[PDB]
Amino acid sequence: VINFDQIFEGAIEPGKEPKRLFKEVYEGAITATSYAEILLSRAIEKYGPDHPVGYPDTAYFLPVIRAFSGEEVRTLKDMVPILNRMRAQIKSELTFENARLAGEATWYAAEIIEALRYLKHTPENPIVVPPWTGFIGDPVVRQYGIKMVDWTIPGEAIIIGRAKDSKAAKKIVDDLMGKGLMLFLCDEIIEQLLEENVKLGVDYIAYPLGNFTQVVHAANYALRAGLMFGGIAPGLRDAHRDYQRRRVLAFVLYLGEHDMVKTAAAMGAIFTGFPVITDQPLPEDKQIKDWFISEPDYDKIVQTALEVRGIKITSIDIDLPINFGPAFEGESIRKGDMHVEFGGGKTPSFELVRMVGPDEIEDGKVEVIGPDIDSVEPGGRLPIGIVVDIYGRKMQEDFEPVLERRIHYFTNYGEGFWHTAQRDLTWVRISKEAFAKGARLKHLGQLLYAKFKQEFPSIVDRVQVTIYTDEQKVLELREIARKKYAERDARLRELSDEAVDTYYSCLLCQSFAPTHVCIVSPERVGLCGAISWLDAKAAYEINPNGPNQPIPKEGLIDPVKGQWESFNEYIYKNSQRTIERMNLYTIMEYPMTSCGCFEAIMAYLPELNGFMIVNREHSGMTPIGMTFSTLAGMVGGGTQTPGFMGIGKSYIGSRKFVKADGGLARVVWMPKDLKEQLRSIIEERAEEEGLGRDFIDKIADETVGTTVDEVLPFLEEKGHPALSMEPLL
Ligand code: SF4
Numbered sequence: 001v002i003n004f005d006q007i008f009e010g011a012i013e014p015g016k017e018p019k020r021l022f023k024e025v026y027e028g029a030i031t032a033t034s035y036a037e038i039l040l041s042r043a044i045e046k047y048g049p050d051h052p053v054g055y056p057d058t059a060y061f062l063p064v065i066r067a068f069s070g071e072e073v074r075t076l077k078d079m080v081p082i083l084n085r086m087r088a089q090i091k092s093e094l095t096f097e098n099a100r101l102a103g104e105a106t107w108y109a110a111e112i113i114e115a116l117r118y119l120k121h122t123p124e125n126p127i128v129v130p131p132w133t134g135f136i137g138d139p140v141v142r143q144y145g146i147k148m149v150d151w152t153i154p155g156e157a158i159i160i161g162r163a164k165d166s167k168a169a170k171k172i173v174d175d176l177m178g179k180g181l182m183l184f185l186c187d188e189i190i191e192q193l194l195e196e197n198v199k200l201g202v203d204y205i206a207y208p209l210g211n212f213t214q215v216v217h218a219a220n221y222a223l224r225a226g227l228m229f230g231g232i233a234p235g236l237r238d239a240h241r242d243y244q245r246r247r248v249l250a251f252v253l254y255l256g257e258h259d260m261v262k263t264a265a266a267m268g269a270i271f272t273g274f275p276v277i278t279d280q281p282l283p284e285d286k287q288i289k290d291w292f293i294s295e296p297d298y299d300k301i302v303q304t305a306l307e308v309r310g311i312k313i314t315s316i317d318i319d320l321p322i323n324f325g326p327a328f329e330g331e332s333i334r335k336g337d338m339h340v341e342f343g344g345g346k347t348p349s350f351e352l353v354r355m356v357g358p359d360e361i362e363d364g365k366v367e368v369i370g371p372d373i374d375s376v377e378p379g380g381r382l383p384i385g386i387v388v389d390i391y392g393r394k395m396q397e398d399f400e401p402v403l404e405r406r407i408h409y410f411t412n413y414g415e416g417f418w419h420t421a422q423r424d425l426t427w428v429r430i431s432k433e434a435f436a437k438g439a440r441l442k443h444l445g446q447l448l449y450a451k452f453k454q455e456f457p458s459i460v461d462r463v464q465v466t467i468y469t470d471e472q473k474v475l476e477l478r479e480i481a482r483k484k485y486a487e488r489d490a491r492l493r494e495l496s497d498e499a500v501d502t503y504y505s506c507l508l509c510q511s512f513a514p515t516h517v518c519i520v521s522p523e524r525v526g527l528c529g530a531i532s533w534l535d536a537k538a539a540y541e542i543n544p545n546g547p548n549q550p551i552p553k554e555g556l557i558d559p560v561k562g563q564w565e566s567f568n569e570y571i572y573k574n575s576q577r578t579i580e581r582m583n584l585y586t587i588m589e590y591p592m593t594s595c596g597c598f599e600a601i602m603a604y605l606p607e608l609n610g611f612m613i614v615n616r617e618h619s620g621m622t623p624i625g626m627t628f629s630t631l632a633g634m635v636g637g638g639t640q641t642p643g644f645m646g647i648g649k650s651y652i653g654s655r656k657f658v659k660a661d662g663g664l665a666r667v668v669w670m671p672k673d674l675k676e677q678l679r680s681i682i683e684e685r686a687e688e689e690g691l692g693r694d695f696i697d698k699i700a701d702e703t704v705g706t707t708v709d710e711v712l713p714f715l716e717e718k719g720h721p722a723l724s725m726e727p728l729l
Pocket residue numbers: 506507508509510517518520526527528529530531595597
């Protein structure tokens with residue numbers, strides 16, 4: 001029902017087909033299929049029809065075939081019918097559809113030729129040697145293709161052929177790897193880059209697959225994503241094509257002299273929705289308007305690819321003493337190696353983002369008031385304050401908090417920087433090697449300016465940074481930052497589910513939980529715990545086309561359970577028609593689904609007439625007879641699970657917390673540490689609900705027991721209200 005081919009309509013005017021390209025693709029597809037046929041015939045003559053065939057370290061047989069038509073190739077005989085079908089779909093009528101079919105058949109033939117090549121592979125005598133990868137194993141696909149489909153990797157570049165010269169290859173490839181794109185390299189371009197001393201490999205997500213049919217090892221890798229994270233069934237061809245077009249932002253760079261087989265493989269990439277850009281000049285009758293295009297100028301080539309693919313690159317190269325990269329963010333200056341820590345010892349510290357007018361401040365201002373880092377011996381400590389001023393043609397005060405949390409990430413983006421927490425509690429810290437390598441505060445303010453200009457092109461125009469280090473001035477501005485925090489917290493305090501007419505979807509976790517849809521409301525945070533209603537609203541207003549969308553409350557169904565037709569229909573359209581109803585205020589009937597990053601899991605226990613809760617960090621056994629990870633396997637994945645629900649921790653303190661199930665009064669068990677961490681909001685909420693300030697003492701924890709038999713006598717002795725409430729069954 002997908003009708004994927006819609007996407008190609010209008011690429012070609014009627015009667016104006018690029019017939020030379022289609023003739024080349026047809027000859028190349030017949031050639032590749034003939035190669036595969038005769039090679040399979042000789043393999044069967046040599047080993048027998050029932051001989052095993054396959055790739056190392058994969059659960060998906062021949063993944064391209066397994067996805068597009070579903071066969072689980074395991075022996076040579078299995079390939080025989082497939083090739084027949086492929087030959088039948090290579091048709092001589094010179095249409096764009098027949099060209100796409102011929103490209104699909106070329107992918108099938110290359111996949112078969114590669115598996116036949118692996119007939120001689122053993123771990124003791126590999127056919128793959130460094131630096132080439134050949135077929136890439138499933139574990140690499142898990143680890144990096146999850147980032148490929150959530151778009152933390154901006155895109156993928158499939159480069160076949162050669163660049164005009166080795167330095168031009170190094171130029172475009174250093175450009176692409178510096179913009180973070182994953183690279184699949186096939187043929188002589190590998191040797192070009194290697195003589196230019198470019199590092200390459202799986203650790204750099206630059207895979208030198210090999211030559212000729214090895215290009216298919218990009219395709220199967222891509223298609224395994226759809227088999228693996230998308231959950232699409234084997235043989236659902238158009239569903240896999242749509243998933244590739246939608247999630248895998250890949251394109252082909254077809255460099256060097258054309259040959260018919262490479263062109264047929266590029267047409268197969270077009271068949272699954274990947275545009276091809278070539279450096280060769282093309283006549284009009286050998287090109288397609290948005291799919292097979294010439295960009296001879298190398299200075300532009302990369303740009304054109306991204307523009308045709310819809311990729312939007314954030315990154316910008318910048319002149320810094322210190323190398324900047326995300327991978328450092330796990331670094332820590334443990335107490336043996338602390339250099340110049342700020343904050344947390346009651347040493348003053350603060351951070352703030354603030355909107356401003358246009359003509360009272362200038363772009364690029366970067367000031368470091370007071371002492372720099374030069375003023376201390378190792379092991380020292382100074383007070384620090386920050387100001388990041390922003391003007392934008394579209395900027396709003398609403399965006400200010402959403403940017404502040406980013407400075408956290410920004411500061412850990414380079415070596416020797418370490419920031420945890422936020423606002424007045426900004427535990428800023430510096431490493432000794434960084435001030436050994438000569439980095440100072442001015443470069444860090446430049447780093448914040450550069451990242452703010454990179455990540456928000458639509459909204460920020462004229463931004464500047466000013467740091468302060470005086471112990472007295474830092475407090476003078478800490479007070480004003482407190483005033484800003486206070487007006488923001490007051491605006492947050494105003495919000496209730498009833499005070500707003502619109503909730504916000506979150507689809508961010510469909511990268512690994514395709515049927516899951518979050519609905520964020522003012523009194524129910526996203527179950528990851530990191531997306532509030534204000535956050536999803538600002539993310540939509542910044543990026544209207546993004547994964548957070550407004551949903552008006554329309555079509556009321558259940559006033560008490562919290563069901564509306566608008567939320568039902570949005571979830572149904574975005575859950576692949578698997579979820580039809582959702583109740584906001586209960587877990588016992590049509591609960592919201594979960595992905596898998598939930599901070600805690602609730603479960604109803606009829607034996608205790610109430611809810612247990614267990615946070616992700618708790619590793620002990622729970623009264624339901626399972627630990628958190630066992631329950632997580634059953635509660636996540638976008639499936640509706642009445643009696644169970646994933647939640648953020650702060651939701652436990654919401655006034656709306658499972659209000660139709662009895663709310664906080666219904667909670668009978670949670671881990672002791674989670675109870676202590678939430679003790680204040682639990683005490684407040686139980687007080688205003690009439691349960692008493694002491695209600696938290698009635699909640700059982702693991703020190704009372706881990707089974708219902710141990711827990712019930714405690715609940716009876718304490719008079720826990722849930723025992724007098726209606727059973728929820
Ligand atoms: S848990 Fe929900 S709100 Fe949080 S990122 Fe995932 S989909 Fe979005």
